[PDB]
Design a protein around this ligand. Sequence first.
Ligand SMILES: CCCCNC(=O)Nc1ccc(S(N)(=O)=O)cc1
Ligand SMILES: [Zn+2]
Length: 257
Amino acid sequence: DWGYDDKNGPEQWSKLYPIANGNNQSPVDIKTSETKHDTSLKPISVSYNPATAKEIINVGHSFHVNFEDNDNRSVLKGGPFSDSYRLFQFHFHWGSTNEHGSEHTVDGVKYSAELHVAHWNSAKYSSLAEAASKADGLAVIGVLMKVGEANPKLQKVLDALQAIKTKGKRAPFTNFDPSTLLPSSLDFWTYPGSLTHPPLYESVTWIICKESISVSSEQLAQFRSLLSNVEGDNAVPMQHNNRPTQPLKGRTVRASF
Ligand SMILES: CCCCNC(=O)Nc1ccc(S(N)(=O)=O)cc1
Ligand SMILES: [Zn+2]
């Protein structure tokens, strides 16, 4: 029912999901002149076990790489959190051209793509389904992806896409530690926000990395060559899946640096 095209896209999500016009919507434009350094923010701690990697899924608007989330083998701690957050997925957002494709922007600058590494609060809640609609339920690391040199750390992910070309296809995706995709510096911004597509729950604590990672023009093309249609139908490439930035509405973006 929802998507990224003209009739079902971001500027229309509010008809089915009124929280779209809420006070804690994501993504945002990070204005570095308006951020507040917070001395209480601890370094980000990620410890992921590659044996938790499970499956890669074509979800029609994007692709998801899911992780086993039955225990604390793969966790996020530190930064603004007192609780341990359990890794459950990573995915990307991209745009129709290299000029845009990130969700977050920094001082108005649009990057070519963005990596999301998503976690849920296993200290307070017993499942992702319980966590997902709670204010303290989710934590997502965002990494801005700057077009330039090919990023070899994306190879396993890109190589997998040929097995999940059309909507609904899934394949095993094992023995992968997504902390390998993160930049060298985990200096970050944090703010309270939302999922960036339906159901748009205001349940996400965002961790946005200061440092970008690279991606090539041709790697982005591989994302855009995934198909949003089911097998046998007319091919409809996944040209874009980035939401525009949303108003801060009085929220503070904190910097660790
Ligand atoms: C409603 C239960 C959660 C559903 N979502 C998921 O399974 N994945 C997911 C979707 C979007 C985001 S984002 N773009 O980081 O705001 C993070 C995770
Ligand atoms: Zn996302």
